[PDB]
Amino acid sequence: KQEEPDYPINKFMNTTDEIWVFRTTQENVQKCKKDKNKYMTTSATFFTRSHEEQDQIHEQELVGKFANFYDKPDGVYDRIDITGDKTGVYEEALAYASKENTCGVVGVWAFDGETTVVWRELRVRNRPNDATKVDEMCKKKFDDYVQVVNKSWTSPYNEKCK
Numbered sequence: 001k002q003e004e005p006d007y008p009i010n011k012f013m014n015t016t017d018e019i020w021v022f023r024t025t026q027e028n029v030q031k032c033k034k035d036k037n038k039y040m041t042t043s044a045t046f047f048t049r050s051h052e053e054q055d056q057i058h059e060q061e062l063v064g065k066f067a068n069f070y071d072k073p074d075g076v077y078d079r080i081d082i083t084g085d086k087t088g089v090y091e092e093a094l095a096y097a098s099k100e101n102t103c104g105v106v107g108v109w110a111f112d113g114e115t116t117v118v119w120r121e122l123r124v125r126n127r128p129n130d131a132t133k134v135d136e137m138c139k140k141k142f143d144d145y146v147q148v149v150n151k152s153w154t155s156p157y158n159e160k161c162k
Contacts (some may be wrong), residue, residue: 006076007097010066012104013037013045013080015125019104020161022134023122023142023153026108032057032161035123042066045080057162060085069093088112096141101125103138105145120145128157 013019014037021033030051039046043066050059064080079093089110096105102125110117122142128134146153 004096006068006078007094007104008076008078009080009092009094009106010040010042010045010077012094012097012101013047013064014040015101017125018127019123019125020128021121021156022103022124022128023139023155025119025146025149025151025153026121027119029154029156031156032158033121033156034161049085051156052161055160055162064092085110088117095120095145096138098135098138103135105138105141127159127161129159 019035032052037047066077068075091109
């Protein structure tokens with residue numbers, strides 16, 4: 001089995017397009033969850049992460065310091081260590097990215113008060129109104145994962161999202 005390429009998360013998040021959460025295994029679902037990148041250096045990205053509660057937008061300014069997921073020296077930056085999130089997310093890592101980064105599968109690690117909470121999201125550049133144009137290879141990587149961990153997923157997005 002040929003080794004999959006590492007998926008650079010700095011290239012995935014380097015866009016002015018909104019990156020919407022299209023699928024998630026998160027239990028406490030944030031409706032209309034999305035990211036808007038604002039600035040990026042070689043060591044960190046700066047982005048606005050938002051979601052809606054009762055149709056009202058809640059925003060946070062987050063910082064992600066690039067790193068390699070396996071802590072390999074000089075490895076590909078497929079991971080960000082996150083500061084500024086009041087929900088406790090401290091790391092995300094890009095498990096798959098489509099060509100031109102139109103879609104990505106992102107694992108999330110958070111800390112509540114007791115232990116690390118882990119889930120996974122399928123993220124799409126621009127509004128995923130036409131699901132038939134979202135890369136099926138991206139969907140299948142997410143499907144393969146939810147089959148392995150035996151979990152169901154929901155979609156935080158609908159047209160109503162601001």
